[PDB]
Amino acid sequence: PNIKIFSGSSHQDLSQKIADRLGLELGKVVTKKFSNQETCVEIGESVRGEDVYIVQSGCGEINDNLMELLIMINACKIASASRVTAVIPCFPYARQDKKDKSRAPISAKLVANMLSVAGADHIITMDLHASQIQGFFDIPVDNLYAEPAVLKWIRENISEWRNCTIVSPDAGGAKRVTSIADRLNVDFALIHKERKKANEVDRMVLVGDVKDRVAILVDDMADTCGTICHAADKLLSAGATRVYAILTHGIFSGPAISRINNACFEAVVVTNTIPQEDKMKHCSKIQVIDISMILAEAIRRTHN
Amino acid sequence: PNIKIFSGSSHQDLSQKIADRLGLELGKVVTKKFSNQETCVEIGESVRGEDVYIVQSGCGEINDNLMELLIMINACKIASASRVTAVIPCFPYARQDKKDKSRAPISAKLVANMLSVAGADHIITMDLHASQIQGFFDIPVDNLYAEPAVLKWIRENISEWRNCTIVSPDAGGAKRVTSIADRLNVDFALIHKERKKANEVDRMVLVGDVKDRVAILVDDMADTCGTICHAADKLLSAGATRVYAILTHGIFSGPAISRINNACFEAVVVTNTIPQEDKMKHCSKIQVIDISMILAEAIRRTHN
Amino acid sequence: PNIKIFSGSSHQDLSQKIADRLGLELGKVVTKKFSNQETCVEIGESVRGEDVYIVQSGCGEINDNLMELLIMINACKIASASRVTAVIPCFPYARQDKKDKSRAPISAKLVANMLSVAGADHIITMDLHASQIQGFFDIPVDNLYAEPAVLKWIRENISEWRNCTIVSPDAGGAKRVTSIADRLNVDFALIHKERKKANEVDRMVLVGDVKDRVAILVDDMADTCGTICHAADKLLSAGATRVYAILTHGIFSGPAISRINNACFEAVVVTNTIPQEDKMKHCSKIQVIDISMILAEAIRRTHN
Amino acid sequence: PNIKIFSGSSHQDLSQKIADRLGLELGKVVTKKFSNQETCVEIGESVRGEDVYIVQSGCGEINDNLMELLIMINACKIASASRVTAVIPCFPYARQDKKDKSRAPISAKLVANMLSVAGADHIITMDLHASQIQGFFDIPVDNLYAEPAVLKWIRENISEWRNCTIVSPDAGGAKRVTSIADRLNVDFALIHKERKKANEVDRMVLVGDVKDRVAILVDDMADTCGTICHAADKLLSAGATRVYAILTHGIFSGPAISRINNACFEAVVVTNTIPQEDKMKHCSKIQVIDISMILAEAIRRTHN
Amino acid sequence: PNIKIFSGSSHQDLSQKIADRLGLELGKVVTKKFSNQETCVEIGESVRGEDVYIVQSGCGEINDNLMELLIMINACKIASASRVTAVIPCFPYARQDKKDKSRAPISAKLVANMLSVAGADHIITMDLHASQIQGFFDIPVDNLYAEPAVLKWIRENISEWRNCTIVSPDAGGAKRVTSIADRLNVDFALIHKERKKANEVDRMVLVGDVKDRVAILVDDMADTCGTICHAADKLLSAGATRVYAILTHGIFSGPAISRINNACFEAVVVTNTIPQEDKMKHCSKIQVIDISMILAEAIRRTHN
Amino acid sequence: PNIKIFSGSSHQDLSQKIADRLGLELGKVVTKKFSNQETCVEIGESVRGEDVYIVQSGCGEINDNLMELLIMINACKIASASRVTAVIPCFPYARQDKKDKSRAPISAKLVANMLSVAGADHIITMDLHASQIQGFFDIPVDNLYAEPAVLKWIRENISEWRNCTIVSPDAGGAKRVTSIADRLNVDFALIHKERKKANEVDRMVLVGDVKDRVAILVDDMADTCGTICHAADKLLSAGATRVYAILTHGIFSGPAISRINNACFEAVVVTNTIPQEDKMKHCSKIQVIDISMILAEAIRRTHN
């Protein structure tokens, strides 16, 4: 079997980078929409007995892209592919990973079941919102981490990183922040927005010392940037000299770009698990880390 | 168990009509989008041990609506509903019901598998593009027909229906047209667009006599209305006095409205398996048949 | 893995032809009946890690043959075959492909499920009665077409084929007839037997012109030959000079042979998806098209 | 839910007896053959939300009957039956319960899988050839025993039963014979036909004393009656006064009737798990035990 | 259906309390070991059509108890129980919820799959180590919380609770501690043991102010009590006046009792999700919160 | 793919012997217990695309070992092993192979389902208590026999084996004893312990002649040795000169060692499907047959 790399419509630049790093051309696929907005998938070459990798991030038109991915997986399976791997750099519906409300769906589990029934044999993803999503499948799931790239960026771009403090923007990010602070041998702090019991002002509590130090906000994602922006205001109010934000998934939906442009961030650093070209054109603060080498190595090791 | 009727975002007017005919209020559901365009489903009441019917047509934002339906089905199943029935008046991806091309997906089968893995126990649908889609599930699938309503409309709205000829716009509609012509005891004709071997003019062959008679075009759906419009031009060129078009699914995507407005149709008749309010505002020729009684009776009989 | 071709009891001559075209000997199998008429299957060689193809048509003792096929598939799977492919030239129960009656089984779906649970990984078949039967499986299903062989026979055996008209014996055959007429660039006609509302005479309506032309009846199968015989009487009554019947599946059950012998057919042409040796001995009008090359190529391409 | 009893073509007299003992009429089913010998099943009434019991023994046209049963189960499941129970008095392919030969199928497991995929929720059977066949399903399997009826017959029909010896015709029947001898507080003996190493005379070894005593041969089934006839010759040669044979499944295939008529049996006693009307007309030695009360009680207790 | 409560060998006192609160007697079960240490389960009453709840905590002989639970679930399913619910107050293998090491099993997912294949229809558990374990099943999973009982204990047993600080013993407990601190409107602190890069002294970093205040350590479990004991030493070294430890799962395996007896805890508070009778006899500091009302209410609401 | 042999904690000496006979080193695995007695499995090498064989007998800590085996199978499957084979020399729970009691579990079927859901693709076992356990899986199951080794031992260690009688200790062993007696061309006898109707003395009935001959007791297993010890007393009381006991599975649980030491056995012969080192130290009568060559050949042939 040979590696066949197919791109969905979501992140074709990343698919191209992966294919170039693998020394391959992207597989011939036409991924369009029928007139009635149904997903049209036209695989343009044989995948018989091939090791098929389909790259599709959960971003942009989320349901469009997920349906595209499922249809492409099923087409490859029925086309007698030896193995079909879904390379999903940002797993869609990953934040819906539990039922902590009445009648709430576990949408991540539903997405996993849909991928399984489409015929996926392997999942490669980066920085799952919850690592337990690996357990939502009965197939191997590669949960790659961008933390080494994030440490590289910190050591190369922040001069006073040895005296910095890594800040969690919420309680759920504590493990990630403590891991990064341990690897950098630096202090850490945590910021918590307390629960909205009524309609008073949202107030943020900070535990840890950030006074007269560079604060690096590290989180798994920035969707609306409310978390990181509120944390940044709190950090400046607490005496931080400079504030950085490093995420692995830059979703930047809704008011995020205006929020960041009006915030105090020295830089907002994200990986390219989600396309950032449009976001960078409206926010100069955004910088991107390439994770295509991580995904390419994951695909190569999965194949080998 | 009690009937619980939940509406997706696709066709809420039809859901309301079904609920009124059942003497029920629609179940409390919030069906919105998160900021990153992920489907958000918030069932607002208990469905424990209930007989849940979710109404969601394959129309509008097709993948959005299908994901909404799957998430709602899964939420109801995990919320311990006694039975979850997907009422899908127009089955999405129904035209992708076979693999007659290399690497082509059977998207209808994938949709059926996704509905099954979401936890649907029963499917109620109207006029499947292929009745064999019933066999794509391992659960009961109700394939309701709007043909009786179509005969009622013909007998009540076309004065010379006893001398009319029912015309198939393509070869695949022959069974439907012959059935309708048998029930009306009228002649039938078939129109075929021959295969596009090169880039010459599309030419249509008509078998049957339509000269100086009213021609009724009957088909399962009109997506772009290319089929019915070309058939209408052929029928007028063949000497038909008046031309009607009766469909059960009025998709009317793309250039369909302009095509119909510039066509010679006496009336374009569709059911309300797909919302038609917007279409009727731009095309006076469109008239709608209510099939809410058929769906309500199907739901009631399924429950009983 | 190596190709292993095993024959059931149904069509062993076709299995032999396939094996010869593949340059192989048929695998050693004893397919008999126990005294109590239970199917006895004794595979006489190892199939460990082999690519096993089991040839069994749905014909003759239908349930006997299908049980034989299922038992052989399961034996090969438990015997650790690398892949088991069911080569079913005529798919049994294919006409029971939908539920259009109360309490009606979808027997084709049941047969597909039985083949899947027996352990089939691949299905190779010719001219499924409904192509959607491909969607009854979750494994790849090859639906081969004998249409090219049927065009070859027409061009080589009917002198006036360029002025002929291809006739559908019922409404359901319209797509097949239109495709053949397009490929031959000839006229087509359709014959419909209207529905039996009471016990009066069956009457047939013909749409299209067949007067003073050779009429070629093309259908997917001739079971009792009532359809083709009634169509032939109608065609002669309509002024056809000569009438041919071309089928891909010659079932010829019940009164078919006497019907054909008393009909006006110039020739009844079938493929050898079903054994025809016995039928040809009692009906000189029957001629056979060899499709063993199509099946052999399908098996070879599936393996490769 | 209400009890619905449906009969296959195999044993309709037993189905009638069960229905009468349950105070019910048999459900309306037409179980015939299409012209091409495909099984035709036409359930003539609603089974929606019903507790459906389908009675079909593995006997007569074995594959015909099993396909009939599977099609009826699937039709009932798709017809939204609350529960479908297969009442199979004699389980087909039960003797193919293991793989003790190269490439041998486990046909009993295949039959169990086919019943499961057809949609059976419950199996009721009598005296499985191997009780471990219960483990071939993931659904409850009732393995009823006719041993109490066999003890009743012995105590009522054999005057010297207290001095009799119960004889196993082979090594595999030892448990059944020891159980019966324990319940009767009588001696037991075992007869073994040693393995056929070459083409010499089959010789039988008897362990136990049967001299000048009535010998009762007890086995689970008599297919060709070679086992019981050879055992009877051995028992007479060993000095048994009278020889009885009691089976639960009287298959009596092939030469069994001539073998019994030429044997020395005082009586051959079988249950009516298989129809015996034809067998009794040609062999006066055959007597039948009614087990319809056992099956009716099993169905009633399953329902309750 | 009626509630049937069955106890495994793990926590029979809790099962008795649940049954008393439900006004029921425990179902008759003999749960012993065969001589070869295989689990022997003897359900002593009918569960046909019953709503069966099996109470078995993951504690004591973990694999013994889990096998007992699986065997009891399967026995109830094969005994035709209407519904089988596994009441597992402490989910076994819950800490093995992800693959963050090469070749590491996801044992929680394996346990979920084993429970599913045993036939469990519903899981009721308290304070899953990871809430995403709910997504390891395709059945409803009730993840009950003992947090309200923990707040009740704090408000009733700690006089200065309004000036206390709730302390996380590790980074992973941050969400639980922040939730509790929000509900009590008190400060929170976090303690992190930094990663063991080499064999030097384990050192703990504290973020937050605990000086001259009562510190309440809140965590999901205390297995060896290394986490809480090290956190307690750090808290006293940081100037905490008194230190409490509140857990929901008191495992207290290995050296935990000696560790607590030599620690500075004012009280170690656990729920009775695990039996604590033996632990309390050797450690006076341990106090227990009854959660039997939570489990009983969960069972009652699941049934209703 | 390469053979990877992994040992569980149950029988590591047998795993070592198998690996040496295969010319391999055992795969690196740490199989220990966490503090709370949960099974800890740490596979120390890659198994990607490997043919993994896990050796784990059902013996010792039965549930501990079975959980170890399941966790190792699942870890290998998630670690992308090409194929995972469970080499289970003594199948656990094999005696719970049917439901002959109310509410009784079929624990063998549950174990098979657990192995299947853990991801086993192949089972290799020796002398299943019931061969129908092969049918409890849908994967190939190798049921190897130690009978040839048992015949070798008899012919090499019993001087008067040609005049011996092979004795079944119960009715269920009759087939095994008759097979062995046929292969040795010797007489056979059967011993039955009649059913315990009340609390009187257990009495044993012997059928067959053992007077003044060597008696060889052959059974599938000796758990408590009650069966073989009672049979030995009966055989001596019946005039047997010497009594041997040959088993394939020496469980020797509970009072078995004291029973054998106080019995009259010339030798108790078992295979090493279960470790016997401890048993031989307390009972000089026990001798062991090596079956490692049988298991090694089975693994090699499965791989090839």
Ligand SMILES: Nc1ncnc2c1ncn2[C@@H]1O[C@H](COP(=O)(O)OP(=O)(O)OP(=O)(O)O)[C@@H](O)[C@H]1O
């Ligand atoms: N795309 C989305 N955008 C915004 N909110 C979402 C989205 N998907 C799910 N949610 C909602 O967000 C919430 C999950 O929030 P979040 O992941 O920040 O915290 P958590 O899971 O409660 O705790 P933590 O991650 O700190 O352990 C849920 O209520 C979920 O329904």
Ligand SMILES: Nc1ncnc2c1ncn2[C@@H]1O[C@H](COP(=O)(O)OP(=O)(O)OP(=O)(O)O)[C@@H](O)[C@H]1O
């Ligand atoms: N939403 C869609 N809009 C347009 N074309 C579609 C859509 N979905 C599928 N198709 C394509 O349309 C074709 C199916 O066309 P159609 O159903 O008219 O004819 P058919 O299935 O070949 O024959 P017939 O229905 O006459 O038996 C396929 O090539 C399929 O990929």
Ligand SMILES: Nc1ncnc2c1ncn2[C@@H]1O[C@H](COP(=O)(O)OP(=O)(O)OP(=O)(O)O)[C@@H](O)[C@H]1O
């Ligand atoms: N072997 C068989 N012989 C005869 N009739 C059969 C057989 N199997 C199924 N049938 C019945 O024949 C009918 C199917 O007929 P047929 O395939 O000619 O038409 P259709 O499916 O209604 O329409 P069309 O094929 O024209 O789209 C069903 O009522 C089915 O039960």
Ligand SMILES: Nc1ncnc2c1ncn2[C@@H]1O[C@H](COP(=O)(O)OP(=O)(O)OP(=O)(O)O)[C@@H](O)[C@H]1O
């Ligand atoms: N319907 C049948 N008629 C005759 N033989 C059959 C039938 N079905 C299976 N067999 C064969 O009969 C054999 C099974 O024989 P039988 O059940 O008498 O003995 P066994 O299973 O080896 O041992 P025992 O039942 O004494 O424990 C197998 O070789 C099987 O293939």
Ligand SMILES: Nc1ncnc2c1ncn2[C@@H]1O[C@H](COP(=O)(O)OP(=O)(O)OP(=O)(O)O)[C@@H](O)[C@H]1O
């Ligand atoms: N019963 C057990 N006892 C001890 N350690 C266990 C047990 N089960 C699993 N482990 C191991 O403990 C580790 C999990 O530790 P823990 O749950 O404290 O932290 P985490 O999952 O890495 O992060 P966190 O819970 O803070 O988000 C894994 O290495 C796992 O293999």
Ligand SMILES: Nc1ncnc2c1ncn2[C@@H]1O[C@H](COP(=O)(O)OP(=O)(O)OP(=O)(O)O)[C@@H](O)[C@H]1O
């Ligand atoms: N590990 C075990 N130790 C002891 N008894 C067990 C064990 N596992 C199951 N049993 C019980 O032993 C009985 C099975 O006994 P046994 O296998 O000797 O006879 P059988 O299956 O009734 O008949 P036979 O094997 O002679 O055909 C059942 O009641 C079963 O529950």
Ligand SMILES: O=P(O)(O)OC[C@H]1O[C@H](O)[C@H](O)[C@@H]1O
């Ligand atoms: O609130 P947003 O900034 O839109 O979302 C980003 C954060 O919110 C969620 O907890 C994520 O895990 C991130 O920590």
Ligand SMILES: O=P(O)(O)OC[C@H]1O[C@H](O)[C@H](O)[C@@H]1O
């Ligand atoms: O009616 P018969 O000639 O027996 O059967 C042959 C035809 O009937 C069915 O529609 C088939 O598809 C063929 O078109």
Ligand SMILES: [Mg+2]
């Ligand atoms: Mg979250």
Ligand SMILES: [Mg+2]
């Ligand atoms: Mg967060």
Ligand SMILES: [Mg+2]
């Ligand atoms: Mg179509």
Ligand SMILES: [Mg+2]
């Ligand atoms: Mg059409």
Ligand SMILES: [Mg+2]
């Ligand atoms: Mg037809």
Ligand SMILES: [Mg+2]
């Ligand atoms: Mg047998």
Ligand SMILES: [Mg+2]
């Ligand atoms: Mg026998």
Ligand SMILES: [Mg+2]
């Ligand atoms: Mg923790």
